[PDB]
Amino acid sequence: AXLX
Amino acid sequence: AXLX
Amino acid sequence: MDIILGIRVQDSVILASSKAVTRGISVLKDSDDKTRQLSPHTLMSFAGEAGDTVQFAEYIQANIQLYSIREDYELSPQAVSSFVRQELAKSIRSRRPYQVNVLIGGYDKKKNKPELYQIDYLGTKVELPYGAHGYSGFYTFSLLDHHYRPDMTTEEGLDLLKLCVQELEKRMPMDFKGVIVKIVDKDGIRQVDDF
Amino acid sequence: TQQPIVTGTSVISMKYDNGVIIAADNLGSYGSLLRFNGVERLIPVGDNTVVGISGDISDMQHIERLLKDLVTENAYDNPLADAEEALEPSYIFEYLATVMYQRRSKMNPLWNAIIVAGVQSNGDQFLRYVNLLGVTYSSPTLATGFGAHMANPLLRKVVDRESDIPKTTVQVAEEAIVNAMRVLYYRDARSSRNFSLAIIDKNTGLTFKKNLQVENMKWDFAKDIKGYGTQKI
Amino acid sequence: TTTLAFRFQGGIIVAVDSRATAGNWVASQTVKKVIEINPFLLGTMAGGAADCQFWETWLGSQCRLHELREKERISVAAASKILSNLVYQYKGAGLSMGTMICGYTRKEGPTIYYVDSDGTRLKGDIFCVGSGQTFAYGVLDSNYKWDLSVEDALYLGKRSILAAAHRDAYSGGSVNLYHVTEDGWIYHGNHDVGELFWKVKEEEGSFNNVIG
Amino acid sequence: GYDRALSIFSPDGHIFQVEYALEAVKRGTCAVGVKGKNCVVLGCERRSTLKLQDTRITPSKVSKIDSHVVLSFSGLNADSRILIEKARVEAQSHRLTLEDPVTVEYLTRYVAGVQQRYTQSGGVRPFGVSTLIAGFDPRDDEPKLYQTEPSGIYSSWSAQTIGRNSKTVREFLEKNYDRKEPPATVEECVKLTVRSLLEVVQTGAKNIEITVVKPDSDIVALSSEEINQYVTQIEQEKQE
Amino acid sequence: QFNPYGDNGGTILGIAGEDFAVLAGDTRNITDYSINSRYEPKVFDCGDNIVMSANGFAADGDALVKRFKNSVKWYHFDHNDKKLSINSAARNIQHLLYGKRFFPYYVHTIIAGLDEDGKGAVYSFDPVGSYEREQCRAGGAAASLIMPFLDNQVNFKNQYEPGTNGKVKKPLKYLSVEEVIKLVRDSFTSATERHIQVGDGLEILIVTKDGVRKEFYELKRD
Amino acid sequence: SDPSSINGGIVVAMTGKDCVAIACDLRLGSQSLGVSNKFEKIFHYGHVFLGITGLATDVTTLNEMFRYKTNLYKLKEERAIEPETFTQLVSSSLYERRFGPYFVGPVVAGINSKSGKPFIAGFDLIGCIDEAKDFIVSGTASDQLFGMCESLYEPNLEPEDLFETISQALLNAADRDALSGWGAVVYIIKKDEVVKRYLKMRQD
Amino acid sequence: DRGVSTFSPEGRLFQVEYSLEAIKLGSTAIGIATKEGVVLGVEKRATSPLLESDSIEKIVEIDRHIGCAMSGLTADARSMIEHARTAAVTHNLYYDEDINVESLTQSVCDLALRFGELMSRPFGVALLIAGHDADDGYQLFHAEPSGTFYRYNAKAIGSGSEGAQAELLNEWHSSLTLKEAELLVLKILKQVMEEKLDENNAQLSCITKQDGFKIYDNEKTAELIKELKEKEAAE
Amino acid sequence: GSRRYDSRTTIFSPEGRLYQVEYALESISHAGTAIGIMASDGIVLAAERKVTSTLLEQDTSTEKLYKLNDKIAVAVAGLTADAEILINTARIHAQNYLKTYNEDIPVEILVRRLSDIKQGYTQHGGLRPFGVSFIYAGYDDRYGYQLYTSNPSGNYTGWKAISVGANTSAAQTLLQMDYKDDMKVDDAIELALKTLSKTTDSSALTYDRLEFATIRKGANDGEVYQKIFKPQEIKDILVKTGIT
Amino acid sequence: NNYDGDTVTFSPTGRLFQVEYALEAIKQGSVTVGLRSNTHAVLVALKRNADELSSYQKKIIKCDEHMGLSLAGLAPDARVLSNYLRQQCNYSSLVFNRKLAVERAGHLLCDKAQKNTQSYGGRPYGVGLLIIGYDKSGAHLLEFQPSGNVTELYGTAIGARSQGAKTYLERTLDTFIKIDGNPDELIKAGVEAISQSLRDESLTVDNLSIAIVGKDTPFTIYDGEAVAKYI
Ligand SMILES: [Mg+2]
């Protein structure tokens, strides 16, 4: 899952 | 701890 | 967190505590007050794991303030310190222990004596003429072993503290952005504004 | 968190025009030791479903018991137990699939790969797979273990897509399955010669053949192989 | 991510980028990293996309219940402390958040709290947060005055995110801009770096490191 | 756990255990609260069938809940300790999470809620206590006075009294309190409070307590002479 | 050590037009270097004009789809047969996913249908429930091959107006369903060429105000 | 990371003719850093004396615990707890924490006030009793203490002789350990007077 | 004695029936549903003139689109309101939308029969629940301690209810404007109240789609009171 | 079910009294009288034993006076067995406070917790209350010498002098008469014994029907000593004030 | 009389009075009718209102695509029981991919009700239910009473004056049982059956409630203008  |  | 010191002189306890808050390669803040008033004549400074420090301090503060209201009385510094120690001593065997070290500086009004307690996160308590947590002690203890006298005035105490902060600014690897100093004596707790 | 001890190798299967065939050998290995030889790994449920199982045999025996208890429970207060409310293959599968996925989700799997073969009451062929991870899929052919690697390519030569199923007779399909079993005996170090096979036909019902053997083996050319390169005698 | 928020003469500026990454894979260029909690409250997102989005929209629900129960809008201090006390409960479980809670109340004035998943909570006038924080800080710090006009403040915020979007591989897409006053928050647009970079280079004459 | 539904409905729609808890309040010593323009005063009768009392250590009747809010009561004394402790804990917890001390309304609503909970839970009887809760919201100078009762209902009062003969002293205050002109000072307000208590009390001797609460955590209990003076001064205006 | 996850491959793709939306996925299912099935659908009609795919670890994908379908059932039971709007589905799915934050569903989720003004909508989710509405999204194994193609062909990225000196962008515009199916089919044949886990078949579910239609196309079987 | 040698320190106890002695050093440190010079490790509950070495937090905790337990004992039994009995209570209490122990090495000394007999004992961290005629040793300089005691000790010393002997065992053991020292206290215990002497020792 | 969950020989729950008596003793509450809004008005009934009447809160916000009035043992309603607010806010968290008025009401009503030997007795308070949602428009619900709820075009509860309901039966028609409905609630309240209706002992509120749920100030209500006397005098 | 046999120990009467508390108090009123008197320089506890047999072992006995810690004792009127349950609780609570704060528990704090326990038995749990009233005598450095009482309701109050158990009406009147603030301990000793002498239901007060304790600063300098009188010591103090 | 204090007490003639009093709230309930052919099954219910300003209380609840019920008596108790049914039907789908047999639904309700008739502190359910459905063996109608007795029938009715309809259905049996492949005719018969239980009232457009399930019809509910066709 992504991060920002 | 002491052994026997 | 990082730098917290305390010196007890004739008639007061002085706490000095660094202002920097650093995460990663950024100093997020340079005016952090690493202290909570527990009662009108008792002050606690703290350093350790991020989040844990404030959560612990505020929790002790809430408990001591509750006691004060309940009994309409101020717990002695010795009593508060013992309460705090027990809390840390329980914590050290919890699923997730509080990683916080504290200095408790108080003026005992029954005895008319200032008192300084140093307590680490394991619940190790000691009463001392002067104290420090973390790497700070490695410079200050020896310096204070030299320059400290038991009967110093509050002014002599602050000069002695200037020595400690100067040494730490000379030899410490990190920029801790100065200290906030607070005096605990017979008249309560006050903050020196130019250090 | 488990490790399989006594184990069963491939289970292979396919659909044909009127039904489904499924087979599996009668071995229970213990690492490289071929420990047990009379092990039935196809379990019929009613007269419309066979469940073939590979992997840990202790977990297979557990699953047998679940299925036999399921039959019992379905008969309870059910006057149509041997008619409209008989257990379908799709019911038996979903139940197993549910259990497999729950056990993986509790980090304590049933160490198996399962193929449920049968005929639904409307005559449709049922073939579906589920394993220790709770992964499920359907295909005209299905196999587990080495079977997936060696049987599938052979069985798909016969039934390569949906439309090939009407064109495939039970003689053709049984041939393919029996030949696939021989290959596996040539090539899988944990297979046995003896196996069982079951056909579930929408007309003839369930035929369960025990004590089959791999036959018509080619070994003769072995005599001509001397050395590993340069040796002559 | 890069996110920032700073206090000044004319209220609070809040500016963020819009990129999400999984390793080096650019997963999205259109993430809304500011959450509008109520007309006087903003939250910024950095760290785990899900963690931030979920708990910050959960935070909004908690703030709504405060005002139903107490017949009053929640203080920035109390809203930030709900989030920080929540994440502190999960300390060690591996939540990943760096957030700023930004707003005006009459009792507080314009206020910013930094709140992260180790349970750190800080009041302050300037913060930058995310993988691009240092880049944003460099520009922001070296042009910041308490007295910036609203016009200048908005630009500085926008320009600071641009700086970080350019240098930090894990920041980019577009700038989202907000101004917060005694009357609440005002949105000041979505600005694609696609066109904003070239516009700023031309008009300002900066970014000479870049082949014009 | 002991489960019995002790607070239940009777055929006429009454909850007798709540109503009997009210009877226990009625038997309690009198308490009155009066709010001035800029203060709130709490007066309490102490029943005088008791000499050899030690007043240094005997539980006073007005309790600080936080440093800006006080609570007094009429009814069962042991019951009131339980509500005061819970209220004190909540006051600290509110400061911890909201970073602001409680409003007087909030704290009242909390105590009221506790009281109500004990009227529809198995195995427990209601609190035989009604409370007067008074003080000033943080950074506010407008005085607050609330009343709660065993049922859980609570409300705001210009002035109010509870306990034995409270109907006599409510009577007094209803004709002597001008909504339009509340006791413009401390001196004024303390007096009205002592007058109303003298309707019911006896000698104003070791019979009356007064506690004054002004804004920003300014709470002080008057001692015998300071009260005594008020008593003396009212009877000397009485012969007319 | 037992590993509770696996990877079943395949890839999925959602595009949204003005008054329609599509959700496509290949029909191949794999583990390691073996094919499990050449036709095992993974895009589903979930009722209320919502289609959903959850691609990655199939067992998790099936569990999630099952749970959401069931969620739609109870939404009807509890709120007087009300239609579940796409925005509401999206938010519900966030909670389904984030509820398993500390033992996630290993899937990339996409749903498609129509928003409340009748416009086409596509929503995508990371494995623990971050979500966002878009014109456009590919997910699963070949996502990294297909997504940049879609940025170029659906949102006209890096495309300028000829002779405007790279100063005027190609202007945005909705695509016909005929155009969208062309981009989908090309996206998947390209993906099949260069990714070993993608192939066999392509199934497209198209969603308009008259319901859900399916289209199927053969893909290369190697 | 070895909790029994983070703070440092030692305790030794010896029997004599109608007396016992128990002594400790005063150091409390955090690894290399000496922190306090006034940290005593010997406590008493009536006429029974307990010394505790090891992790200082546990030393403090266990003192607080045994004060508690002996106070209640006195109230219920209407007499002061005797050393033989206290020894048993220490053992129970430690073994109760068998799989999450206190990191301590306690030592008990005193005179049974009925029988007049001198009594000493030592324990491991999980409660094993070591009763001895002669001496018990504990702490980070225990090897050294064993050496000093085994050679210096002789039975039946007079209190002022026993004092010299136990003091010399303590001092010379402490001086070969980096984590012990920084001061020392010796208790001489006779049937009903107890003298407490602070020793002069090297402060490095 | 005898179980709290016992049926009478007529097949009714004693405890539920008895709570209905307690509700008849309650101060009056009235609600009217129009196509322009829903009005909710109540009788404050201060038990003594010293008690500061604005502190009497018998009309209550649940969410922006839902409001509540109560009658009976009003302390029993705190937890029902709390549940209602949570149910509404939670629904919006789970579904990114407003919760339907009927669904809200059904949620509150689920609490009601959770008593026995769960709470020790039924609630002693009835609720009028009024709101708007896109599907079924403006709505009024009467929620009893029996767990039953009924939709109404208009409804009165509390002591004055059988008088007021008969009156509402005559005055309600499908085309009332909001302003007509406000007046009507004021009029019917003045009829059944003991003391003389003014802006301090009655209170009004509405919920409209456009501005949601608002409680009216005393200045605004005082003026609708004045406007009502002038309407009656003038014929 | 079992509802049939439930006395409902924790309900209100229609007058708003707690039946069981009232009835417990009624029980206590037949118990041996106990008296506490507070002086400026100490406290006296005196109590009358429930009527002896000559064969009772009177010196190794305790029925009335119990030690809570070193600075606090109680005098009991009611069920002895009920009282011991509470006494061990109180003794433990004292030690928890000491362990936590390294300071002896302030007298009121101990008294409040015990009274809070009693209060609970009147509000929840459906159990009978404890049939006990205590007089607490103790010293702490906040308030010095203190006397308190608690009863089955869990209400407590502080006193210069007080009695519990039988004939408290007569006893209270007599203490009111002769008590005066500046009193020394030795005067209070006399007052206590003279009061029992006149209120006793026995023919005459003898050593063997009494328990007696003082709490004085009468050790050495600024510290406090509890003396629980031996039988022979009571016999002497009974002569010394001419009651025998 | 002395034996009606709770459900855990038998009377000296072996009766359970609390269960009998529960049965009584059913009798005060508005009438509802069930009947079925071989291809469909129909519920008709008369809805009751509070007064002329009120709604007409729903008496029909959908349980699954192939199952549903009508209620007479305590409505919250129908909500509890219908909700249990929804779950049980649901569990049968998710786990076995099997639509729950109407017969099993019957047995499951009986066993749920029974528990509350043998243990202290509980209370019997105060509602009667008519369950219709279409499953692997065709159309079904069940009657549930809170004694736990469940019964399969071609037709029946419950609530006040249900004896009118139950007689009518008893004579009509040979006719309605053979209304196959005609939804509207089966409904007409149901509406007529219920009419035998009216007094001083007749079926209005916001008074009548009908439901049907069968061979190729999902369980659906008709109210308002959708029932005008039938008056
Ligand atoms: Mg050394």
Tab-separated table of N, CA and C in Angstrom, chain C residues 103-178:
chain	number	residue	atom	x	y	z
C	103	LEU	N	13.076	14.011	36.323
C	103	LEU	CA	13.598	14.671	37.504
C	103	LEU	C	12.426	15.332	38.196
C	104	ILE	N	12.289	15.090	39.495
C	104	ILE	CA	11.256	15.746	40.286
C	104	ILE	C	11.895	16.717	41.273
C	105	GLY	N	11.605	18.002	41.089
C	105	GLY	CA	12.097	19.053	41.973
C	105	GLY	C	10.953	19.680	42.747
C	106	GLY	N	11.076	19.703	44.071
C	106	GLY	CA	10.012	20.212	44.933
C	106	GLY	C	10.515	20.924	46.173
C	107	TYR	N	9.711	21.864	46.673
C	107	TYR	CA	9.957	22.479	47.974
C	107	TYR	C	8.990	21.904	49.004
C	108	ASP	N	9.526	21.131	49.944
C	108	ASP	CA	8.742	20.587	51.053
C	108	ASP	C	8.491	21.683	52.093
C	109	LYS	N	7.230	22.087	52.233
C	109	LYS	CA	6.858	23.183	53.131
C	109	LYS	C	6.807	22.786	54.616
C	110	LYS	N	6.603	21.502	54.922
C	110	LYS	CA	6.678	21.037	56.317
C	110	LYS	C	8.114	21.091	56.838
C	111	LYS	N	9.069	20.724	55.987
C	111	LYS	CA	10.488	20.703	56.360
C	111	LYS	C	11.219	22.013	56.057
C	112	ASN	N	10.628	22.840	55.195
C	112	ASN	CA	11.309	23.997	54.600
C	112	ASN	C	12.654	23.620	53.973
C	113	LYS	N	12.632	22.568	53.158
C	113	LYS	CA	13.807	22.120	52.414
C	113	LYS	C	13.451	21.898	50.946
C	114	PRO	N	14.371	22.248	50.028
C	114	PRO	CA	14.190	21.855	48.641
C	114	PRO	C	14.692	20.427	48.447
C	115	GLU	N	14.092	19.701	47.507
C	115	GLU	CA	14.428	18.297	47.275
C	115	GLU	C	14.422	17.968	45.787
C	116	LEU	N	15.411	17.186	45.354
C	116	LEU	CA	15.534	16.789	43.953
C	116	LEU	C	15.611	15.271	43.841
C	117	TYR	N	14.687	14.691	43.081
C	117	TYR	CA	14.673	13.254	42.852
C	117	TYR	C	14.961	12.943	41.396
C	118	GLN	N	15.845	11.975	41.181
C	118	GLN	CA	16.154	11.481	39.852
C	118	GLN	C	15.593	10.074	39.753
C	119	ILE	N	14.723	9.857	38.769
C	119	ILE	CA	14.094	8.555	38.559
C	119	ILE	C	14.189	8.170	37.089
C	120	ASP	N	14.725	6.982	36.805
C	120	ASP	CA	14.784	6.488	35.423
C	120	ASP	C	13.571	5.619	35.088
C	121	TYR	N	13.468	5.213	33.828
C	121	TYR	CA	12.305	4.468	33.341
C	121	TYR	C	12.101	3.097	33.998
C	122	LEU	N	13.144	2.543	34.617
C	122	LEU	CA	13.017	1.274	35.349
C	122	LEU	C	12.385	1.458	36.732
C	123	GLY	N	12.276	2.705	37.186
C	123	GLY	CA	11.782	3.003	38.526
C	123	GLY	C	12.911	3.063	39.537
C	124	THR	N	14.083	3.508	39.093
C	124	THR	CA	15.242	3.626	39.963
C	124	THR	C	15.259	5.041	40.510
C	125	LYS	N	15.048	5.180	41.817
C	125	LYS	CA	14.930	6.493	42.440
C	125	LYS	C	16.117	6.778	43.340
C	126	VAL	N	16.584	8.018	43.285
C	126	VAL	CA	17.680	8.489	44.115
C	126	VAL	C	17.438	9.972	44.426
C	127	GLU	N	17.666	10.386	45.673
C	127	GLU	CA	17.652	11.817	46.017
C	127	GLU	C	19.077	12.347	45.899
C	128	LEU	N	19.224	13.523	45.290
C	128	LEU	CA	20.535	14.055	44.909
C	128	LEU	C	20.635	15.564	45.087
C	129	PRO	N	21.854	16.067	45.361
C	129	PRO	CA	22.116	17.509	45.285
C	129	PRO	C	22.021	18.054	43.860
C	130	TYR	N	22.460	17.263	42.884
C	130	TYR	CA	22.307	17.611	41.468
C	130	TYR	C	22.119	16.350	40.630
C	131	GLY	N	21.363	16.476	39.543
C	131	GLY	CA	21.008	15.329	38.716
C	131	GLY	C	20.885	15.630	37.236
C	132	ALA	N	20.966	14.572	36.433
C	132	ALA	CA	20.844	14.669	34.987
C	132	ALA	C	20.453	13.319	34.403
C	133	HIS	N	19.772	13.347	33.259
C	133	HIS	CA	19.460	12.132	32.511
C	133	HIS	C	20.078	12.167	31.124
C	134	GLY	N	20.352	10.980	30.591
C	134	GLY	CA	20.914	10.842	29.253
C	134	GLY	C	22.402	11.126	29.240
C	135	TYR	N	22.909	11.554	28.087
C	135	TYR	CA	24.342	11.804	27.926
C	135	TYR	C	24.821	13.053	28.675
C	136	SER	N	23.896	13.956	29.000
C	136	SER	CA	24.211	15.191	29.729
C	136	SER	C	25.065	14.957	30.971
C	137	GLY	N	24.690	13.955	31.763
C	137	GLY	CA	25.392	13.630	33.003
C	137	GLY	C	26.883	13.407	32.823
C	138	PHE	N	27.265	12.871	31.668
C	138	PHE	CA	28.667	12.576	31.377
C	138	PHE	C	29.585	13.807	31.360
C	139	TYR	N	29.013	15.000	31.208
C	139	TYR	CA	29.778	16.242	31.351
C	139	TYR	C	29.513	16.954	32.673
C	140	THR	N	28.256	16.971	33.108
C	140	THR	CA	27.849	17.833	34.217
C	140	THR	C	28.196	17.280	35.599
C	141	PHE	N	28.018	15.978	35.815
C	141	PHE	CA	28.305	15.388	37.132
C	141	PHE	C	29.701	15.752	37.644
C	142	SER	N	30.708	15.618	36.784
C	142	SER	CA	32.094	15.916	37.156
C	142	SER	C	32.298	17.408	37.384
C	143	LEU	N	31.720	18.209	36.494
C	143	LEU	CA	31.762	19.663	36.597
C	143	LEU	C	31.152	20.122	37.921
C	144	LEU	N	29.990	19.563	38.246
C	144	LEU	CA	29.273	19.882	39.483
C	144	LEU	C	29.966	19.303	40.718
C	145	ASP	N	30.556	18.114	40.590
C	145	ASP	CA	31.407	17.563	41.653
C	145	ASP	C	32.461	18.584	42.078
C	146	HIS	N	32.924	19.371	41.109
C	146	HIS	CA	33.953	20.377	41.323
C	146	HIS	C	33.366	21.663	41.907
C	147	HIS	N	32.454	22.290	41.168
C	147	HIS	CA	32.003	23.656	41.475
C	147	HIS	C	30.867	23.800	42.499
C	148	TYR	N	30.123	22.729	42.771
C	148	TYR	CA	28.924	22.827	43.620
C	148	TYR	C	29.267	22.879	45.113
C	149	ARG	N	28.557	23.737	45.845
C	149	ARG	CA	28.629	23.801	47.308
C	149	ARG	C	27.202	23.679	47.864
C	150	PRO	N	27.024	22.988	49.012
C	150	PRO	CA	25.674	22.713	49.538
C	150	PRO	C	24.834	23.950	49.881
C	151	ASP	N	25.494	25.040	50.264
C	151	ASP	CA	24.819	26.240	50.774
C	151	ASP	C	24.669	27.377	49.752
C	152	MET	N	24.730	27.062	48.462
C	152	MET	CA	24.657	28.099	47.428
C	152	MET	C	23.296	28.795	47.401
C	153	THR	N	23.294	30.060	46.989
C	153	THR	CA	22.052	30.799	46.783
C	153	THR	C	21.462	30.413	45.434
C	154	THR	N	20.213	30.800	45.209
C	154	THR	CA	19.560	30.580	43.923
C	154	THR	C	20.353	31.233	42.783
C	155	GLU	N	20.925	32.409	43.035
C	155	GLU	CA	21.765	33.077	42.033
C	155	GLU	C	23.050	32.305	41.750
C	156	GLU	N	23.697	31.807	42.800
C	156	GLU	CA	24.882	30.968	42.635
C	156	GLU	C	24.526	29.706	41.842
C	157	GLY	N	23.366	29.125	42.149
C	157	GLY	CA	22.841	27.970	41.418
C	157	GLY	C	22.683	28.202	39.926
C	158	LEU	N	22.117	29.347	39.552
C	158	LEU	CA	21.934	29.684	38.137
C	158	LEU	C	23.252	29.903	37.389
C	159	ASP	N	24.272	30.418	38.078
C	159	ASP	CA	25.594	30.621	37.468
C	159	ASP	C	26.257	29.273	37.215
C	160	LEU	N	26.117	28.389	38.196
C	160	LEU	CA	26.595	27.016	38.115
C	160	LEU	C	25.956	26.280	36.939
C	161	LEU	N	24.688	26.592	36.699
C	161	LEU	CA	23.927	26.029	35.593
C	161	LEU	C	24.372	26.601	34.244
C	162	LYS	N	24.735	27.885	34.225
C	162	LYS	CA	25.303	28.512	33.027
C	162	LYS	C	26.566	27.773	32.600
C	163	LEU	N	27.384	27.408	33.582
C	163	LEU	CA	28.565	26.578	33.347
C	163	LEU	C	28.216	25.250	32.677
C	164	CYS	N	27.198	24.571	33.196
C	164	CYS	CA	26.776	23.287	32.644
C	164	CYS	C	26.283	23.418	31.205
C	165	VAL	N	25.432	24.408	30.943
C	165	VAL	CA	24.898	24.610	29.592
C	165	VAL	C	26.011	25.003	28.611
C	166	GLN	N	26.943	25.844	29.057
C	166	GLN	CA	28.104	26.221	28.237
C	166	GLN	C	28.926	25.011	27.826
C	167	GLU	N	29.241	24.156	28.797
C	167	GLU	CA	30.001	22.945	28.515
C	167	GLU	C	29.260	22.060	27.521
C	168	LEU	N	27.959	21.882	27.732
C	168	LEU	CA	27.161	21.053	26.834
C	168	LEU	C	27.087	21.643	25.424
C	169	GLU	N	27.026	22.966	25.302
C	169	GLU	CA	27.043	23.596	23.976
C	169	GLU	C	28.415	23.509	23.291
C	170	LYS	N	29.477	23.327	24.076
C	170	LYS	CA	30.826	23.170	23.529
C	170	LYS	C	31.100	21.746	23.031
C	171	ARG	N	30.668	20.742	23.799
C	171	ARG	CA	31.091	19.347	23.582
C	171	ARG	C	30.027	18.359	23.098
C	172	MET	N	28.748	18.707	23.211
C	172	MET	CA	27.683	17.813	22.747
C	172	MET	C	27.570	17.832	21.223
C	173	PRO	N	27.350	16.656	20.604
C	173	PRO	CA	27.205	16.585	19.144
C	173	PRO	C	25.997	17.333	18.578
C	174	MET	N	24.920	17.436	19.355
C	174	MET	CA	23.651	17.949	18.840
C	174	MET	C	23.376	19.392	19.250
C	175	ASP	N	22.596	20.084	18.422
C	175	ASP	CA	22.084	21.405	18.756
C	175	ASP	C	20.762	21.209	19.492
C	176	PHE	N	20.777	21.377	20.811
C	176	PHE	CA	19.563	21.181	21.610
C	176	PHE	C	18.766	22.478	21.827
C	177	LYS	N	19.202	23.559	21.177
C	177	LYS	CA	18.462	24.830	21.117
C	177	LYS	C	18.211	25.497	22.477
C	178	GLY	N	19.173	25.391	23.388
C	178	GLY	CA	19.085	26.079	24.677
C	178	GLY	C	18.173	25.382	25.670
